[PDB]
Amino acid sequence: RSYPAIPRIYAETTLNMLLKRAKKPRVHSIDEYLKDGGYQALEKALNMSPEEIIDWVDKSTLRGRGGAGFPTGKKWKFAVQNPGPRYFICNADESEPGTFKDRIIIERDPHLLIEGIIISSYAIGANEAYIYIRGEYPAGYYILRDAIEEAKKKGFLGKNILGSGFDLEIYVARGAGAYICGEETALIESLEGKRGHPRLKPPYPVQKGLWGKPTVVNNVETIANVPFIISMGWEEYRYIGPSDYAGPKLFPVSGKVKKPGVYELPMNTTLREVIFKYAGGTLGNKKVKAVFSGALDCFSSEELDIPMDYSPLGFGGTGTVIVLTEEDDIVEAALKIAEFYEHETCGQCTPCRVGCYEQANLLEKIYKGEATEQDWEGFDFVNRNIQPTSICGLGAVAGRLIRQTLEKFPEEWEKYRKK
Amino acid sequence: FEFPEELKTKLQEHINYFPKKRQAILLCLHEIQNYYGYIPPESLKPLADMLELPLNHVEGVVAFYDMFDREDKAKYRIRVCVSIVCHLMGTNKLLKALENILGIKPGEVTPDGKFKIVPVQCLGACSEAPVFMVNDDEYKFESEVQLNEILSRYT
Numbered sequence: 152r153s154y155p156a157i158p159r160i161y162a163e164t165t166l167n168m169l170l171k172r173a174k175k176p177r178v179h180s181i182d183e184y185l186k187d188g189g190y191q192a193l194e195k196a197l198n199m200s201p202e203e204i205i206d207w208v209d210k211s212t213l214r215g216r217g218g219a220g221f222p223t224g225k226k227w228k229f230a231v232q233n234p235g236p237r238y239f240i241c242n243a244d245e246s247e248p249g250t251f252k253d254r255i256i257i258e259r260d261p262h263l264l265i266e267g268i269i270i271s272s273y274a275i276g277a278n279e280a281y282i283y284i285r286g287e288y289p290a291g292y293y294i295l296r297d298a299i300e301e302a303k304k305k306g307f308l309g310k311n312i313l314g315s316g317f318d319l320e321i322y323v324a325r326g327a328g329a330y331i332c333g334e335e336t337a338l339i340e341s342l343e344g345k346r347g348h349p350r351l352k353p354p355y356p357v358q359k360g361l362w363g364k365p366t367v368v369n370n371v372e373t374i375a376n377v378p379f380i381i382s383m384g385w386e387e388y389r390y391i392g393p394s395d396y397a398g399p400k401l402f403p404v405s406g407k408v409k410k411p412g413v414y415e416l417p418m419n420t421t422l423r424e425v426i427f428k429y430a431g432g433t434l435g436n437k438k439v440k441a442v443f444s445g446a447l448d449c450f451s452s453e454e455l456d457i458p459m460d461y462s463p464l465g466f467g468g469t470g471t472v473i474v475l476t477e478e479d480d481i482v483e484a485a486l487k488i489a490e491f492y493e494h495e496t497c498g499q500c501t502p503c504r505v506g507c508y509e510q511a512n513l514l515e516k517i518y519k520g521e522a523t524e525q526d527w528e529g530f531d532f533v534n535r536n537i538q539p540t541s542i543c544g545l546g547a548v549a550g551r552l553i554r555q556t557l558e559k560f561p562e563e564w565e566k567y568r569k570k
Numbered sequence: 571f572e573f574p575e576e577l578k579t580k581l582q583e584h585i586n587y588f589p590k591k592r593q594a595i596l597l598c599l600h601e602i603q604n605y606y607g608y609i610p611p612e613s614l615k616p617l618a619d620m621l622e623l624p625l626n627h628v629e630g631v632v633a634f635y636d637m638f639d640r641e642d643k644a645k646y647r648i649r650v651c652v653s654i655v656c657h658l659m660g661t662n663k664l665l666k667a668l669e670n671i672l673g674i675k676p677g678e679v680t681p682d683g684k685f686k687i688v689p690v691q692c693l694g695a696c697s698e699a700p701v702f703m704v705n706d707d708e709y710k711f712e713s714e715v716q717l718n719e720i721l722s723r724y725t
């Protein structure tokens with residue numbers, strides 16, 4: 152079986168959990184997975200009640216790895232308070248800049264993700280599950296389609312799984328180039344065969360989701376933790392990292408580091424340790440200027456001693472680490488972020504539609520030294536006014552990272568004002 | 571406009587795959603583009619009929635999703651990431667090397683209709699920056715010599 156070419160992303164682990172097999176850049180098929188005790192957590196899960204599974208996932212302290220860190224067990228509890236039929240959705244859209252953590256699991260250990268989907272679907276009583284994978288991950292799509300067939304042939308999917316009376320089908324949908332289809336309500340709209348337009352929340356998908364039914368949406372990485380929680384038990388899982396933000400976490404590190412790639416580390420690791428202890432420090436040993444947490448936040452070199460956890464002062468987000476060094480122009484980097492939001496706004500909300508466009512248009516004038524005094528004042532105003540009336544997280548953060556560069560690098564921005 | 575039997579059967583497979591016909595819309599458009607090298611505007615009405623959707627719903631979907639191209643026919647789409655990491659690590663060097671080999675810039679198609687350079691947002695392979703795709707295959711750009719050898723594999 153031949154798949155499209157994929158670059159071999161470097162992967163390293165100190166925990167040997169999500170990357171036990173995925174640290175090797177190749178597809179691990181079902182026989183190899185079974186030899187490691189794969190699908191044995193599913194067999195144990197089918198001998199537990201769905202309520203006991205929700206309870207262990209809750210007590211494990213597992214939090215959403217898609218970026219918001221919402222407690223997973225609590226999300227599942229909300230879905231099961233509502234009458235069925237219910238749906239389970241694996242979010243494999245992964246389109247945030249600098250983020251390549253989820254593809255590592257999909258392309259190398261698809262049975263870890265599949266086992267997690269089966270247990271999670273069983274826990275919430277869903278008989279249909281969906282993987283929504285971005286269109287620019289074609290190898291991941293083909294790998295998943297083949298792994299699901301391998302699971303079906305071994306009796307892990309279909310009707311009456313292992314004589315449990317539990318039925319499940321996993322469908323794989325493909326995206327077609329929209330970052331907004333990563334937002335869970337736009338993802339659902341896309342699964343329903345429409346334009347990827349987010350819906351006003353509340354209702355959250357656990358109340359009204361796919362076809363208006365209770366729906367759980369979880370990120371690939373969140374799901375890949377579920378077989379470990381069942382296999383080890385929640386207590387053992389909770390000894391990994393801080394007991395309040397437990398478990399392995401994947402950190403996609405890129406930019407000006409000696410060893411760019413994915414690192415599986417506990418969340419008590421600091422940002423400084425991620426860069427210098429694990430990613431081998433910086434290219435040419437240049438000083439760190441900034442760390443971009445995807446297109447969401449900008450951390451300065453004064454903020455490297457923070458933990459990589461979901462605490463109020465932790466790094467949070469997806470764990471995405473884009474390293475910029477002393478030579479990198481912050482204004483040129485801010486322009487790339489502005490261009491990203493300009494290209495990805497769905498355009499439903501007027502301040503987001505016009506503000507994402509104007510922020511990039513005016514920042515480009517500033518960068519080229521063609522901005523008037525009015526363009527400078529206009530850029531400042533637009534940056535502060537993308538969020539009003541926004542119905543999703545994109546409009547709420549389109550100006551966030553850029554505003555942080557204005558506050559943290561005033562001297563560099565001031566140089567452009569005089570240009 | 572009528573889909574050739576070989577394409578029509580593949581579209582029917584996608585339509586029968588999901589519990590509801592309309593959920594197959596993106597898989598069908600991906601299939602149409604793969605077959606023709608673009609989305610022919612005349613293909614939208616027979617597809618809308620197969621999905622049991624109004625034509626304007628299908629038109630709105632094609633306009634929304636960035637991978638779909640209704641204007642230029644290309645055998646190979648060279649998707650070049652122009653986002654933050656690849657920009658920092660050498661997108662301009664990759665774009666100059668593509669200009670030296672093929673004589674085209676982003677958004678342009680070669681006169682033979684073989685290659686089109688498509689600038690895209692983050693491809694999720696940032697540790698391998700600068701990243702590009704040649705249809706479904708993905709690569710890290712190393713140099714013009716390395717790139718030239720990659721492109722020679724697409725006939």
Ligand SMILES: NC(=O)/C(O)=C/C=C/N(C=O)[C@@H]1O[C@H](COP(=O)(O)OP(=O)(O)OC[C@H]2O[C@@H](n3cnc4c(N)ncnc43)[C@H](O)[C@@H]2O)[C@@H](O)[C@H]1O
Nearest residue numbers: 217218219221229245246247250253355356357468469544
């Ligand atoms: N792999 C990738 O590339 C990747 O993961 C990229 C992600 C980029 N994103 C950009 O915005 C990240 O998303 C992040 C915002 O994402 P969100 O869904 O708007 O966040 P929310 O806090 O609304 O919800 C988080 C999850 O919990 C659920 N939920 C919240 N309250 C609930 C409530 N009362 N009852 C029930 N459910 C409830 C909600 O339904 C969703 O399920 C941003 O923090 C970036 O970190």
Ligand SMILES: Cc1cc2nc3c(=O)[nH]c(=O)nc-3n(C[C@H](O)[C@H](O)[C@H](O)COP(=O)(O)O)c2cc1C
Nearest residue numbers: 215216217242244245246333334335369370373544
């Ligand atoms: C614009 C935008 C893009 C997002 N993209 C993704 C994505 O690619 N993958 C993902 O799992 N979550 C993404 N999210 C977050 C989801 O809406 C949602 O919080 C998540 O899938 C729920 O899973 P979790 O609790 O396991 O993290 C995005 C959110 C927004 C606002």
Ligand code: SF4
Nearest residue numbers: 497499500503543546
């Ligand atoms: S905030 Fe922006 S991306 Fe989100 S729904 Fe409104 S226009 Fe679309």
Ligand code: FES
Nearest residue numbers: 651655656692693
């Ligand atoms: S920024 Fe180019 S692959 Fe992510």
